[PDB]
């Protein structure tokens, strides 16, 4: 069966660039999406198709997408189990405009190793039990916020960014994400720039690939 | 027999505004019974060498070395002995001290505020009450950025670049570890009116 | 009318001794029961009467008494609202063997100042909003565990492996999951505990002002 | 050139058992002391030969061995760069009683992979930069106190109070002021310790890979 590696951390902690660089160093980008051995799956892709009431809160702008409720916990469990069985899965493409899923999906052919990363990857116990390796990218809220601002502004407004952060992100991260850090088997600090760490994991995957 | 109150915490944690609102609520805004001393006005006179670094934003104003600790210790001892004292007026444009000085007369209560007010054991032991305004690195950086940009007009990337390189390291290595010396911890900052009024009424009970 | 002060912190943090040394320094120990101006209430005396299944789990040492489910939140609310109404409240007495309340209940006459103390004093919004001042005694799990072990062998006659094993399995998780997160509602954080005299005298002098 | 792995964390965090388990799974335990490819060095072995004034403090039970000055950085630095140079080395043996090194030394023959394990392994830049991989075993302080109590009480038959008084007085301050701040120099953080098999197998295999 495929080797499932759960990766978590806060937004802009690097959990994404770390996964992106892992598959890259493994030369998976030079491989056709049809034969790929190592694939990256994002929790962001599994956003819940909002109900009437939820979109009414999002319309106003008070719907926290970092809250564990914003994620389709069941679809994620379903999808991961199916990939375990070695089957092929259909990863949905979210239409943030309508807050529904576009008809357009993403096909993920059975892979040897699967990297599932998200801010609440370890939140659900059933999802957490499916991972055979649990990694948490630990980066100070300090640095993360700094990274977050530079990214968003360079086209979001500075005031808006810090306001959404203080009002919604910080609180959601501290209440649901941070507490899951205790589930990790391995903690990777700083992120993408931690070369020694990245290579340790790419080598572990390589061995599995042989 | 002035009652010295030391107050620390990171910059942008609210320590200055807290001290401000504390004396403001006391209407103490020559005959002052409660005054505010800021560790800021005790920076060391910079050398022509360190000054060149400062104009290049290469000088760490948050490192203990940037403060004249001896002048702080001496100034605070004399205040404890009821002596009037002369606090310097720093001139950042020249990075040395201005000829003029602020005269502070013996007050019954003195509030010494600074990011490293609890750093030197000698200074620390002169405080009869030590307060630490504790706010999250998160919130703090946000306040710092908004202020640096909206009030001081700095470039965003330079604020964060410097924050990562100098402020954060300096805070974690020298400031944060002094928190354990506080008798009372005030969370969030200037908006914690319950805490603010707690120190007010207390400062008032001393004045009477 | 009564000034309600909510006090929290982890078991062993020193919250109890802090509250105790507060009334003591106020001379309230030398005051008469019927005339006491400041009194201390413990969330403890408000343990929930257990069901058949929870008692069963309790006999096997598996019911975490530090989980919020262990406290009778409803009664805590009603009792505190009455105290706000300047009414005389009747405090229940818990019997640990039967895991229920004895018929004997203690009476608390309307005092000017009430200190409500417990590990989950700020856990419920309703109870929390009743306090006009929120205090959290913050002592490192380190120091806290050290104190727990010492007091336990001596008075509780328990052994090390038991103390530590219960701490690892039940206290620590419950303290981190439920107590610690409520610290953010504190107006003032009192570190270390009852030996923080500067902090102690601060609350003591503030209370006296109220009494005057 | 030998691959140097620095391992740190607080005492009783699991750094020692993590290293012990690693070499064990690598079968190095059945290998002759002269045919070993991966060995373990303890900062512990490099305790510094104290002055007359420091044995005075040590005599009065006031010298903090968890302080960076209690470790001989020159000898550690010189010893490591020598293993680097592929040379053979002699690791001192300390009698933490007389506070001096014996004449009796342990022999370490050039190895492919070295594990330098210590509470202050990343404290000195000179030393820290020699490590190709830096690992920090992160374990909660209360959990660490739990293990320390059980271990210390079992062997030295030291009275509980001594163990804790010392901990609060010297161990804790030292850990927080000098060890913890070095965790930011780690490349990988291994939580909890010896029972973290996944992290363990991770390092084991990587080592194996180097050995081929």
Swiss-Prot record, chains C, D:
GO terms for molecular function: ATP binding; cytidine kinase activity; identical protein binding; uridine kinase activity. It comes from the Eukaryota. Keywords: Acetylation, ATP-binding, Kinase, Nucleotide-binding, Phosphoprotein, Transferase. GO terms for biological process: cellular response to oxygen levels; CTP salvage; feeding behavior; response to axon injury; UMP salvage. It catalyses: uridine + ATP = UMP + ADP + H(+); cytidine + ATP = CMP + ADP + H(+). Transmembrane segments: none annotated. According to PubMed:8812458; testis-specific. According to PubMed:11306702, placenta-specific. Its EC number is 2.7.1.48. Pathway: Pyrimidine metabolism; CTP biosynthesis via salvage pathway; CTP from cytidine: step 1/3; Pyrimidine metabolism; UMP biosynthesis via salvage pathway; UMP from uridine: step 1/1. Homotetramer. Phosphorylates uridine and cytidine to uridine monophosphate and cytidine monophosphate. Does not phosphorylate deoxyribonucleosides or purine ribonucleosides. Can use ATP or GTP as a phosphate donor. Can also phosphorylate cytidine and uridine nucleoside analogs such as 6-azauridine, 5-fluorouridine, 4-thiouridine, 5-bromouridine, N(4)-acetylcytidine, N(4)-benzoylcytidine, 5-fluorocytidine, 2-thiocytidine, 5-methylcytidine, and N(4)-anisoylcytidine. This is Uridine-cytidine kinase 2. It comes from Homo sapiens. The lineage of its organism: Eukaryota, Metazoa, Chordata, Craniata, Vertebrata. The chain holds residues 19 to 230 of 261 of the full protein.
């Amino acid at each position: 069966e495929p080797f499932l590696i759960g990766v978590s951390g806060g937004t802009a902690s690097g959990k994404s660039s770390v996964c992106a660089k892992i598959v890259q160093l493994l030369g998976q980008n030079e491989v056709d999406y049809r034969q790929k051995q190592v694939v990256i799956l994002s929790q962001d892709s599994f956003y819940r198709v909002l109900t009437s009431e939820q979109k009414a809160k999002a319309l106003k702008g008070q719907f926290n997408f970092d809250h564990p409720d914003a994620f389709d916990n069941e679809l994620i469990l379903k999808t991961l189990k199916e990939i375990t069985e070695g089957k092929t899965v259909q990863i949905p493409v979210y239409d943030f405009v309508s807050h529904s899923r576009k008809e357009e999906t993403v096909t993920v052919y059975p892979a040897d190793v699967v990297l599932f990363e998200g801010i609440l990857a370890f939140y659900s116990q059933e999802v957490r039990d499916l991972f055979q390796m649990k990694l948490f990218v630990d980066t100070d809220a300090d640095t993360r916020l700094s990274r977050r601002v530079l990214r968003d502004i360079s086209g979001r407004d500075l005031e808006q960014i810090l306001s959404q952060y203080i009002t919604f992100v910080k609180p959601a991260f501290e209440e649901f994400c941070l507490p899951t850090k205790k589930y990790a088997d391995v903690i990777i600090p700083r992120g993408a720039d931690n070369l020694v760490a990245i290579n340790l994991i790419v080598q572990h995957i390589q061995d599995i690939l042989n």
